[PDB]
């Protein structure tokens, strides 16, 4: 009968072990005990991205954003989902928003967000080149 916190911590351990479906299931159990914690959903979204399930990740980003509209990770993971779906303008907007929010919040993710923006812009440009 583990607590929500214990379940999140177990999920995190499984994530370290690269056991992504197991980690995601654990975050689901945490959500069952307390569904009002945005971090459970962004953690699970990351698992779904690693599992190549952007649709499931996107839904979790939406749940996260309803609880925490300022979530840097929700915007970033949303952008990644949208890139997989070939929705480039949306993806770039979400990555730009993640960058802006991280700055406002003084968070340090190294060059991760700018790197993602460059990938997104490169992919958008490639899509244009692929069609002419």
């Amino acid at each position: 009968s583990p607590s929500a916190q214990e379940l999140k911590e177990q999920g995190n351990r499984l994530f370290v072990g690269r056991k992504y479906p197991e980690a995601a299931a654990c975050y689901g159990r945490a959500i069952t005990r307390n569904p009002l914690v945005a971090v459970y959903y962004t953690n699970r979204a990351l698992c779904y991205l690693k599992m190549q399930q952007p649709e499931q990740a996107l839904a979790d980003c939406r749940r996260a954003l309803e609880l925490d509209g300022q979530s840097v990770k929700a915007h970033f993971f949303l952008g990644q989902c949208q890139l997989e779906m070939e929705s480039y303008d949306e993806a770039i907007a979400n990555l730009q928003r993640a960058y802006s929010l991280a700055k406002e919040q003084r968070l340090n993710f190294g060059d991760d967000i700018p790197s993602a923006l460059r990938i997104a812009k490169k992919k958008r440009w490639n899509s244009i080149e692929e069609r002419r």
Binding site: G11, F15, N43, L46, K73, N108, F109, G110, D112
Partner: peptide, 7 residues
């Protein structure tokens, strides 16, 4: 630190 980690 990377953004692709769990909290």
């Amino acid at each position: 630190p990377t953004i692709e980690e769990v909290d």
